[PDB]
Each structure stands twice: as structure tokens, then as C-alpha cells.
Amino acid sequence: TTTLAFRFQGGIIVAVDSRATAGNWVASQTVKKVIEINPFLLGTMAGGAADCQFWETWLGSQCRLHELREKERISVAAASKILSNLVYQYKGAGLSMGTMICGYTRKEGPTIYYVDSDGTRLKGDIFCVGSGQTFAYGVLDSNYKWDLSVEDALYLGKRSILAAAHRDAYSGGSVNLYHVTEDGWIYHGNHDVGELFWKVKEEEGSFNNVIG
Amino acid sequence: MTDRYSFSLTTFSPSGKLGQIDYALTAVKQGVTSLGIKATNGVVIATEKKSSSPLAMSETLSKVSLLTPDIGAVYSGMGPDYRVLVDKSRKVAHTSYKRIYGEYPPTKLLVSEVAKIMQEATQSGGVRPFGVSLLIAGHDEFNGFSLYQVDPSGSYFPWKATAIGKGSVAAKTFLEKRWNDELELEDAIHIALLTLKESVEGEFNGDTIELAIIGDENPDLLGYTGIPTDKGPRFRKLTSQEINDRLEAL
């Protein structure tokens, strides 16, 4: 698994791989690791697949109840804290999660919270979680600027997952891209890593270590 | 089933009276006379053994009860209510004191616990008040000898001497004339027997009178020797013969 999310001028970019493994056996290459909590909020999948799926669609229900009761969009701060407070109740029982709750509201602007199954809740600009997180961080840290364009930011997220997919044995399949704006998230397609690798190699001149 | 009486059965009336407590005091007034007198070196409590039938063995019915080795109790009013209160009083002396401090409670604090139980039957759901007034006599190291009265409301007062029940009004007047702060225990027993004779109609002897004292330590009633600090109970119930001996010098 490799999942990332970063804040920038145009909002938030969320990028994930698609691979699921059981030991060495590749169970799936078509896993949806971005959970669409609602049209305005996104969550990433890392650790336990069920724990992340179940509790983040549950989170979507709690967010829907909030805006029905309060007649106002829930803040990313409040949404992330509902999830972190819930998993903290289960601490010790064996839940496995590492997720980024991503949103863009009026009062906050673009906001990302890293939420963890041992109770951690961190606000931040760049987060990267999974077995291939270190590879993606390298590409992110050396190319990140606040004043990236939407086009360039989308590519940076795509390229960072590709870096992890190449080196990390347990990451790969395809790349899913999302762009989170104040008016909601926009899906930017599924990109097969096999085809993407060769395309990027030729156009970018990178991966000279690999014969093509 | 389930106890569905979770509400108070004792409530304030428009005049501010708590009816059920007043009615409980009326039941005490109908009860047989009992009294208590405090001396310099002891306390005496006494009552009449009003036998319901001559076929009944009145020695098997104890109106004067040991609560602790140094504390005794007598009553006027409803006998069954007294019996269960003695059971509860004996247990609470252990659970809320002896099992904590390793010694028996002082008279005033045991009285306080009994009072609390009687107060709760005046406010708790689905119960009536206890229909008794208690007289509790006792001794403890730091407070010396003492005598207390406890009423159905839960209120308690310390006395030099007093009486409750049937002929209490006349008995209290008799005690006011005879009591002084220089009385020895034998003088107090003599006065107790004189006072009790006035409220008794029929036979007046050791078999119809129940009398106990809180006095000197009785090492002969301890049941064991070898521990110098344990010197025996101060509570002692007088025998039928011991009462009759003092009725000749009456």
C-alpha cells in the first residue's frame, strides 16, 4: 500500500495505489483505496481494509446527521475528531488504521488530518502512509511548493505513487487521482502502472536503470 | 410483582405535621413503661415483663438486650419492631465500626447509627416508620457512662434519667425529685425499683421485672483468662433473685 495527500494553492491532491496482498500472493490489483465519505470529504485506506471501509462510511453517516441537525457543512476538524474519538474507544482491541481525512471548507481552507488506530490525530500539509510511504515522501519533499498549479500537483501525486509502486513490492496495480476543491472533490481517473511506467520513462527520461 | 411502592408513605400535611411519625409516637404511648437512670459509677435500665399469657414463658422474651459488651437497650411500643432493630443495631456495630477500628463503638455513635435506620423508614419508599422508642445505656473509655433516648423520627437526646411509654409523665416527675449528681449505682437501682412500682398493676417481683446495669467490668463473664487488657463486659442483666433481694430493702 501507498497513499498520500498534500495541501496546496488549489486545494488538496489525493493519490493512492491499487494493490492488495495476502503474504506474497497478490489478491487484487483493482482495490479502491480512496473512500468517498461524501461529495466534499475523502478518506484514504491503509492498515485494515475493513476497518477503514466500515468506519469511514460510518463517518459519512455521522457527517450527514451533523449537517441535518446544524444546517451547515461539518468542518474537517470536527469530522476527523469523530473518527479519532471512535477508534480511541476501541484502543487495545486490535483495530488497524492509518488514514488521511481530507476536506476544503470556508472557515478552514484546505485541511488534512492524519488519523491513527492508536488514537493519534495530526493536522498537517503533507502525509504519506503505507509500506511504500518512504519512496513517495522522497519525490514529494524535493518537488513540493505551495504555488503548484492543479495540473502540476496532480502529476506530482501520480509520479510519487509510481515511485513507490516501482520499488515497493506490495504497492502497484493502478493509480487513482483526486482533486479536492471547496465545491467538492473531482475524480481524475484510473491509471494502470504498467502503461504509466513506460510513458513516464520515455517522456521524463527517468528510470534509466530499467531497460525499455 | 416487584415492589412498585417507590414513593414516600410519610408526607407533610398542610399544618407541617408528619402524620405517620405522630401516629408511631401514639403507638409508643400505648406501650409498657420502661426507664433509665444514670449514676456516678453506672447506669440502670428497667421495664415490666408484661406476659401475654401465664402459659407463656416470659424468660424467653427479652425486652432488655445486649448490643455490645458495654451497651444495652430497652424499649416501649411495638415488640417485633424492636426485635429487628436490635438485630440491625448489633450488625451495624460490627460492619460500620468493629471491622474498621478493631474496637466496639462508643455509645453516642451506635445510637447515631440506630437513629439513621429509623430516619430512613420515615423517608424511603414503600415503608412505614418504626413504632418504638428506645432507651440505650452504655459506657466507653473517653465519654464515661451515658444514657440516650431514640424516637420514631430518628431524633435522639442524652438523659441523666428518663422514662418512656404508658406512665412516662408521672415517672419523669418522680425521677426529678430523687436524682442528684452524687448517686452511687445501688442508689440508682433502688430509685429505679421505686419508680417502676408506680406504673405496675399486678405482681411486682424478680419474675415480672426485667432490669440490667452498665457498671464495673465483669472478668467472671469474659469466658477466658490471659489477656490483662481484656477485663470483661460492663453490661450485666440482674437475676430474678438479685432483684428480690433489693425489694426487701425497699
Next chain:
Amino acid sequence: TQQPIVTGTSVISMKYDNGVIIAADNLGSYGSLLRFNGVERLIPVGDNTVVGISGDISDMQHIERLLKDLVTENAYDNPLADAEEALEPSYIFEYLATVMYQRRSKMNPLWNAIIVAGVQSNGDQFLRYVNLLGVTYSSPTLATGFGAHMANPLLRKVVDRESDIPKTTVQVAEEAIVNAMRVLYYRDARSSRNFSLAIIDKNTGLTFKKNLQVENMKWDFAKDIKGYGTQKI
């Protein structure tokens, strides 16, 4: 969680053209000690069902009491208790299977393996298995413990698939069952010579045979076997 103490070994069974047959020996073992020699492990329920039980005997006696109570309960306010609303083999099995799975789910199992054999109202043969884990399955032949390893191969040579059932008579089926019980006595160290056998037929009903013995045993060839390799005398 516990451990079985007093235990019973294999239960074996098969279908034939008009019904089912089931069998089990009469031993209650205490580890390697062959402690109790008169234990009945086939328990009939009505005239259409026989429940065969292996494993822990204390738990077997408990199950026996549950089945006895089930018959009592079914008769309550039931005018057709001995007719249309009598207990079916399928009802008895499903109840036991429910109990077994519930008990394993509380981490306190009934340490048994059970085979329910019987004939339904419409004449259909019933044969199904359940164990301490709540696992269930059906087959033309069924056996527990050692029986699974040694009896099934022999019984499957008679009825290999569904289409072999109408071609198998009650004489051929009983013969196969009796032979399997002999083989188990030769080869299972926790088995006994004495056993019980039950036939449930759609025409002739329930036939319960007690105090059967393994007979026609081959032992004579033992006299020629000497040493473990080189010894001649």
C-alpha cells in the same frame, strides 16, 4: 474450553434403497484404560430417527437428556404428536446443529461428533453429520473418528455416488457395515468387540439390534510370524 475425559470412538453409517443403517461400539474409554464396557452410544428418537454420538461421554449424556426433553416438549398441546406433527430426522438434526455451533461460539463446546440417521415423512433417506465446531455435511456414507479413515473407503465401494443408492439392498448394506466394524476392531486401539446396530427402513420401520459381536476373525496366520526380521525360532 475443556478436555474430553471418558470417550467413545467411531460411529459409522450409510444409505441404501429403502432407508439408512447406523452403528457404534459399546465402550467408554478413560484414556488408554478401557474403563466402561456397557455404554450405549446409539440413541433412538421416536420410530424414525437414530442419533449416533462419539467423543466425550458426559456431554453425550447431556445431549441424550436434551433429546428426551425435545420429545416431551413436542407432545405439549399437539394432538398430532404421533402423526403429521411428529419429530422428523431433519428437525432433530437442525436443533443439535444449532446447539453445537452456539456452544463453540461461547468457547465452551460439547466435545462430540454426531451422526443423525433416519427416514423422512415422504420416505426420503436422511443422513447428516455435525461436530464440536458446528461443521455439518451429508454423504451417501458417513463416519466419525477412525471410522472416517477406515470405514468410509469400504462403504464407498458399495455406494460410490447417489445413483448407487437404489441399487443397494438392506442385506448388502448391513453386510458392509458389519464388515467395517470388524476392520475397526482389528485396527483401532480404543474399540471393543461388542457393538449396537440400527436400521431405519421406510417399509419395516426402526430395527434396533443390541449385544452384537465381531465374528469370523482371522488370527491363525499369527502363528507363522516370528521375530522382527532375522529371527527364525
Next chain:
Amino acid sequence: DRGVSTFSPEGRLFQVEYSLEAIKLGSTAIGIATKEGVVLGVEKRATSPLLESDSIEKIVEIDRHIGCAMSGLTADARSMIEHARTAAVTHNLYYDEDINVESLTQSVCDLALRFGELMSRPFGVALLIAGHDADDGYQLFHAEPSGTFYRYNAKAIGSGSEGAQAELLNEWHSSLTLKEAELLVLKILKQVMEEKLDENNAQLSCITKQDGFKIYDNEKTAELIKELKEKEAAE
């Protein structure tokens, strides 16, 4: 005294019948169902001019496809709305779909008879529940404190209900447009209200398949009131 769950000699529950009397004292609410949508309208009835009338909330959203109007002891409706919202959201969580309008109504009505010696008394409020689903289209239900609910083509509840219902009897037909229904609710509310109807003492809302549940702006309703006045003066 006497039990809270006692039957009368006529076979009716005293407390339920008495709560129905409290609902008769409530402000009027009207609903009309068409093939183009369902309209909901209420009388606000402010007790004083200093009371800011837009804080009077007698029309409420349950979900995107279900709305609700109330009449009677309106404080009692809050826990009913809470339950309805929770039931709608919970079903979506369990089944990844919208809940049927009838099923939502049935869930609310299950609360009604949970009183005794649970809550100490029945609810003193009636609800008009309107919505849309794929199976049965546009629907309007009337939920009572008895636990009973009826489906209606059109329905009025509150103090002016029997006069309004007679009017709805004559005016409703199966070919009504949404615009025709809006004017019809306004017309009948104006008829039964004590004070003169305007955009501040009355409120409109609707539920359509496309746009979902919407409470109308005071500016939008004001235009429909002006359109009503002119067409009544047209003959």
C-alpha cells in the same frame, strides 16, 4: 388516579384521545401531493411582534428525499425528528440506498404507543410526512400519536383542518401541476388563518425528484402570494 394506558368503555385509549385535542389547538399545516411533486405549508403564528418569525421552525428536513411539517405541541416533535433522521441515515448506512417514505413513516409511528408506568405520555403533535421514492413515486402521509398513519393525496392538520379538508376535497384532481398546488396551499392557509397571510407568518416547501426537499425563501413565497391575489381578482 387511573392508569396512563387505560381503555375507555368505548375501546379507546384515554391519553391518545386527549393528545388529539392538543393537536386541534395547534397551528395549521397543509400538504398536497401531485405527479410533479409534494407541497408542504404551515402557519407560523407568532405570539408577539417582537418574536423574530424566521426562528419558528415548523417545517423540517428528514433527508434529501423526505420532508416533514408539524402541528400541536411542537417541542414534542424534536425527538421524533431526531429518530426519523437517525432511521433515514442508518438505513442508508446498512443498505446503500434511500429509505422508502412509508418505511420511514412506520419507524416514526412505532414510537407513538411506547408510553406507560419508556416515556410517561403520548406525543402531543401530529406530523405530515412528504417524500419521493422510485417504487411508489410522490407520497404524503399523516402520522398520529395513536401510531396510525394514512396516505393522502392531500391533507390538513391543526386548528383549521376540517374547513381546509373540505376545500381540498373540491380542489384536488390527479392532473394538478406543482405551481397549481403551491397556490392552492396558500389559498387555503389564507382562508383559515386568523391574521392576514404574508411571507413572514406563513411558510412553503416542496419535495421533487430532481432537487429534493427545499424550504422556500420569503422572497419566493411573496411572489406566489402576489400571483394568487391577481388570479382571484381575475374573476
Next chain:
Amino acid sequence: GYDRALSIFSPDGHIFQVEYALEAVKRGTCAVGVKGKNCVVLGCERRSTLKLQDTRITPSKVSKIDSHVVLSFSGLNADSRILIEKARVEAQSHRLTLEDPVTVEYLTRYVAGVQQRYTQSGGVRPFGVSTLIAGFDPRDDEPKLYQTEPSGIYSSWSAQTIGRNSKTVREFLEKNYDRKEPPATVEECVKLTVRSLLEVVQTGAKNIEITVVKPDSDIVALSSEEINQYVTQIEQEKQE
């Protein structure tokens, strides 16, 4: 546990225990709330039947629920403490979970919910209290003023009064308060609030309390002398 249904319907569709709780509110000392363009003022009556009172330590009539919201009341004093405590706990709970202080409407909706619950729960009687809840939403400069009552209904008010003789002071407010132009300053708002109480109070001495709440958690209680200056100026204009 005690489960008796004390609040029940009557044949005419009334719940008498809730209606009798309103009668307890009618007996309580008068409270008034007025919102200006950039403030809200809460005025309260102190009955002068009690002198030899220690005013330093005696419970004050206006209570802070949070740094930005206040609550005043009319009715049973002991009952009001229970609602105030619950509201204060909920205010801190909201900050803890939502990471934002309560809106005035939310806090009102909570207190009103508690009051409603005590009208259809077994073994309990309704609160003999009506409240005025005032303040400013976080990062908002629009004044807020709400009212609750024993039944549990609540609503927003440009100006409102509760308690004894509240019919009289509401009469005053209805003719003196203009919606198109509310009291533009703190002075004008306090003046209109003191004026409204002077219709009912008696002596303008230690009988009138005034608390001013402004945006961004700016809450202050006026002293005797400061209020006395308003009392003086009002009657000197009246002598004409």
C-alpha cells in the same frame, strides 16, 4: 425506581403540570432582554423585600454559560441551577468534540430539549423556569437572543421579557422597539432596558441589575452607581 407519570394529558388536551410550571415563572422576578445593532443587554429585577442581604456572595441572576454566552431566568431559583450546570457541561463538551464553541441557537436548543424531556419522562416534574439566552456566535457580530419555557418550545426575539408583570414591560417594548432601527449603541440599548424595567420595578436603587454582552466574549456587569446614572437621566427627561 419511581416511575409515576406526573405530566399527562387532560380531557381538553392540556398538560396541567407543564401549565402550572408556567405559573411558577409568573411568580418569579422580572427578566428582560434587548438586542441592539452590536450588543445584547440583559436586565433583571431584584425584590427589595430582602435587605440585610450580602450582595457580594448572594447568587447573581445572570449566569455565564461560556465566555461568549449568558443565561438569565424567571421562576424557581433552585431549578435554574440544574439547567445552568447542564448547559455549562454541554458547552465544554461541544468545545471538546467539535473544536468550536456553541452557537447561541445550539445552546438554546439543548436547554430547551432538557426542559421538554422533563415533560414526558416518568417520575419527574417539569422545570418551573423560563430562560433568556443571549450572546454572539464564534467569529460573528450579529446579536442573538432566544427564549425557552417549561414545555420546551424556543424561539428568537428582537426583544423579550419574562416573569412577574412581564405583560406590562412587553407592552412597553412592543411600542418602543423599532425593527428597522434597533438601539445603535450600548448606551441606547441599556437606556431602553432600564426604561422597560422602570415600568414595573419600584425604586431604581439596588432593584435593577444590568449585564451587557458584546461580540468576542466581551461581557461586563454594571455597578449600582452606573445604573443609578441611567435612572437619574430617565426621570429628568420625564419631568416635561
Next chain:
Amino acid sequence: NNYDGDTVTFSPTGRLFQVEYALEAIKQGSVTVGLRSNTHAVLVALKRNADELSSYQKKIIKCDEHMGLSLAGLAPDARVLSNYLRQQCNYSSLVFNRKLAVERAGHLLCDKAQKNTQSYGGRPYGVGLLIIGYDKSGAHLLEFQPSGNVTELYGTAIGARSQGAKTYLERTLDTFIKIDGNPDELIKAGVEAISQSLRDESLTVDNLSIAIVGKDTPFTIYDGEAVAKYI
């Protein structure tokens, strides 16, 4: 009088008035008919509307593939009791792989209603039920009263004016019991039976509700144009 304040009080003549008042709620309810042959069992129910804008209140509830009932009285109480039947039918299938006998279903309903007639705080159920079903002993029809009394019958009717339909069935007894293997004729007899209880109003397409269960027929409810054939 002085003895009708609660269900825990007998009158001096040994009557339970709260139960009798609950029985009265059934008499106010709309008429429903039940009848059976040896192959099928039928429910016919006259649905009641609030007014011309309103729907007609549903009267028939399915409990299982082989069992269901019709109601008359407090509808929410029928929902509670039918839910209990659904659970009991379900428990029988899941635990014992057994379809619940109609007679045993009656016994369970009797005992559930009884507990509400002997305890303080509660109240009797205010609804009557007609249960039809096909089990291992053929077709069955039951009548439930909230007193607890459950009765097995060839035919019956409950609700307002139910006496007319009950007399008709008492005459036709020998004819309709013989209608085997002909569902349409058995329903015709039920529609003709419920017609003996109508006044001023007649059976229309949204007025009539019919249910049937039989040998090779799962419990199915007919409403709308599906009953026009029988009007």
C-alpha cells in the same frame, strides 16, 4: 365502574372490564372474513379510508410463506402481534428446520395476550386477528381475541356488522368446505360472504383486499385491479 381502572381488578361478578373495553375496539373496526376448504384458506377484508383524499388502511399482514392474518381494531397492536408471529415462525424454521403449525401459533398468541391481563401497569391488546395457514395437517383458520381466547374454525368474521357474514357462512358450511382445487370459487364464496355485512357502500377496486394460501400456493395478498375480477 369502580373496578375498571386497571386490568389487575376483578369486578364483584368476576369480570375484567379493561379486557371487555379492549374487545369493544374490535367491534368498531372494519369487517373482515375468513373461510377455508380442504385445499385452500381465504381471507377477505373490507378496507376503511379516512376520506376521499386518503388511502384505504391495509388489513392483511403476511407472517410467513405458509401463514398470515387479517386485523380489526387497533392497527399498531396488530403490528406488534404480527411481528411476534413472524419471529416465532422464523425461530421454528431456523432452529428446527420446521414450518410452525397454525395451532401452535394460536397457542403462542394466547399466552402473549394473557400476560397483559394479569399484571399492573400494562394494558390488554386492542385488536382481533383472523389467522389462515397451510401446514402438515392441511388448511387452517383461527380467530384471536385479546382476552387470550383463540379458536379454530371453518369460517368466521370479526368487526362491525360481522354477524351477517357469519350467518351466511353458517348456511353455506356444507358447500364451501367442498370447494377443493378451485381457488376462484372459494374467493367468490368469501366475497359473497363479506357482502352480507355491507350497508350504503359496495365493494370497489381500492376497497377490497383478498388473501389466499393453499396446497401449492404461497400466502399472497391481492389489492387494486387484481381484485376487479371478483367485483
Next chain:
Amino acid sequence: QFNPYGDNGGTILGIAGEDFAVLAGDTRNITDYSINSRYEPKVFDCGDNIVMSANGFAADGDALVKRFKNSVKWYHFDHNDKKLSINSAARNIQHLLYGKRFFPYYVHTIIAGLDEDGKGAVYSFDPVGSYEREQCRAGGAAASLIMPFLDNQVNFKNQYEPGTNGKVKKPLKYLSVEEVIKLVRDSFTSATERHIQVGDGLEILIVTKDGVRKEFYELKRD
């Protein structure tokens, strides 16, 4: 110490077509090296044009299917006989599985049917309830033997058009029901050859707009 879990073997396979769906599974049930049954049905018709299989520990598998069938029954009771759509069934099964998150059903679940547009649908679950819509999914013992073959022959992975040499992929043309069944049979025939727990028989349930049909085929019994 008591072990509440076991392994009954078995292999299942679900494929979604353009206007159909198949769910197949072998009929062999085992423990360790023994055969319990040569014909023990593992794929079930659950009503509403939905087929289901829960492979792994058979006791948990039977329990789950039983509870879902029950959920379909109560969905009809509670929601006016509304047809339970395949997506709604999937979300419901997640909640059944996650309900035992800390004492899981030891099974791999697959359901098949048609979506609300009439197109073929397959959903796949892990033991604790995480799920995904998929085109092609094998489960159980021989899943690792079957999936790579399906990647190649259904999705045409690693196949390119002759003459172009890697430049143009083989186009993903739609498969008929006859074509899918051929691939299912060959998948299980190959799995039978190389996996000891696979054999005896193959039962396929086919789902179309017309309903649910069954097909049975013999497998090697060794």
C-alpha cells in the same frame, strides 16, 4: 486448548458478463487429508436473483448464508416486498461480517447477480467485511492457481496484437455465457489436477434476467 476454527477446503469462482453472471464452486468438503463429502452444495440461491457462497470454515459459512437469507426475508417484511438490489445486499453483508470483527467469520464471501441496469455484477468480501465490486474473482484453496489464468484469458493481460510487437493491446471484446462457462470448466479442471482439496464435482449457478439456472459437471475424484 480448544480451537474454535477449522478448514473445510473448497474453491469458488465468480465472473460477471455483459447481461449475466455466474458463481461456481466445487462440491468437495474436507478436513486435513480426509473427504467428508463428494457432493456438499456450496453456492446458494438466496432469492431476489442473488447467488452467494461463503468459502473457508464451513460452520461459519453456513451461519453467514443462513443469516443473509434471513436478512432478505426481513427486508421484504420491513420495506413492502421491495427487491433487494445487489449493491444493497453487499453493504448489508459488510455489516453482518463486521459485527463479528473481534471474533470473525473465517470465510471468504462472494455474491453474484445483476445490477439495477441489468448488467452483470460480482462482489467480493474479506473475513471482517471489506468489499469491492469486481469483474472476476476466485476464492478459497486454489484461488492462486485460477486468478492468473483469468487475468490472461478474460482481461487479455500481457497479450498484444500480432505485428505491432507490444504497441497495441488485444482489444477487450465481450464474452458470451457459453464462452465464460468454457473458461470456468477449464479453470476447475486445471485446479483439480494440481490441488488436492479440489475435485469430485463442479456446480455452476447462472444468473440472467430470466432467473437462476444450474449446471453440474463431474470432476476427478482422486
Next chain:
Amino acid sequence: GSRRYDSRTTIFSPEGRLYQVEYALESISHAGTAIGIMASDGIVLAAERKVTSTLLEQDTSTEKLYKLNDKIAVAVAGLTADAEILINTARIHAQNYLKTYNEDIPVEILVRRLSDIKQGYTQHGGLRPFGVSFIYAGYDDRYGYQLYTSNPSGNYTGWKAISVGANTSAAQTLLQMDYKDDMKVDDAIELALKTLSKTTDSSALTYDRLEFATIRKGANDGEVYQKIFKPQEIKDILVKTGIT
């Protein structure tokens, strides 16, 4: 069933009054008068025992004045047994606060807690209220010397001088007449005794019919001392102030 016998202790009258609270207050008006007076250098608590006897052991007797902790004391008017239940609860609350914060409980916080307990019995539970009114005399370092009262309704208020029990109307008028803000403890002692002497229903005010207590910073340097007066000490202060 049981409903028949329920008095319904927690209901409003048509006028919006709590029946049981009103009737409990009527009970308290017959109890012995208790007075509290607050001065700049301390607080005085004076109270009258109800018609006593010569055979009552006075030196070991306590019915009016109780110690809650080293800084706070109470005067009781009403049912003594009801008061002791609440007194023990208050003593525990004070110790809970001291354990939690390692500081002595502020006077008002203790008073609010006891008053809230009284309030509960008027709103839920169906039980009779406590027939007790308290006068709280106490000191803390926030507000200094403080006097409070609470009654069965659970309402509490602060005072410079206050009376509870019998003849409060007459007593409060006498206190309102002679009380001044710059008053000292020795002057307050005299006022309290003079007020009781005039309002008493007895023929004369003697030592055996009184309980007396002072809370003074007349403890060696910045600390507070509670003094529950002995029978002989009450006799001396009666001679000093010229009442006997």
C-alpha cells in the same frame, strides 16, 4: 395497583407552588430559633434548644450547632434526624474536595452542593423533602467570612445577619434595626443574645437552653478558630452581656 396510595410529593399546585416544600417550611417555623451574624473580624452562631428538662445531659448534648470542617459550621432548624443525614453528606463532600484539589472547600461550593441535593427531592424520586433549614457560617480566602441559608426547596441566599426557625419575622426586624457594617464579634455576640432574649417563647433565657458558637480570626495569627461554647462559658457570656 400501587398508584392508589401515592401522595405525589413532587407536583405543582394550580398556583405554581410545591405542596411538600411549603408544608415542610411550616414544620420548620415551629423549631427553635437559630441566628447568624457576620462581623468584620468573625461570625457568631446562636441557637435556642427546644423546651428542655433538668435531667437532660447538656454538656454532651448537640441538637443545633454542627461542625462541617475546621472552617465551616452550621446551625439547624427542623428535624434533627433529617439534618444529620445531610450533615454527613456535606462532611464527605468537603473531604472529597480536599482530596481532589488539596485545598479546603470554598464555602459557597459546599452550600450549593447541599442545596442541589435538597432540590432533587422536589423534582424527582417521589420521596418527601428534608424538613430542614440551615444557617452556614464559614471562612475561605476568596470571600472571607460568609453567612448563607438553605431551605427544603434547595434555594440558598447570602446574608449579613439572618434567622431561621420560630419567630423569624420578629427576629429579622430586630437584627435589621441594630446591625451595622463596621460591627465587631463582641458586639455581634451581644446582638445575637439580645435578639433571642426578646423573641424567645420561654419565660427567661438561661445557659441550659442555648447553644453558642463563634468563628474568629482570633486564632494566633493568620488562621481561623471555631469555638463551640461549653455550658459554663454560655453562663459567663450571659452574665457579661447582662442578661442574667
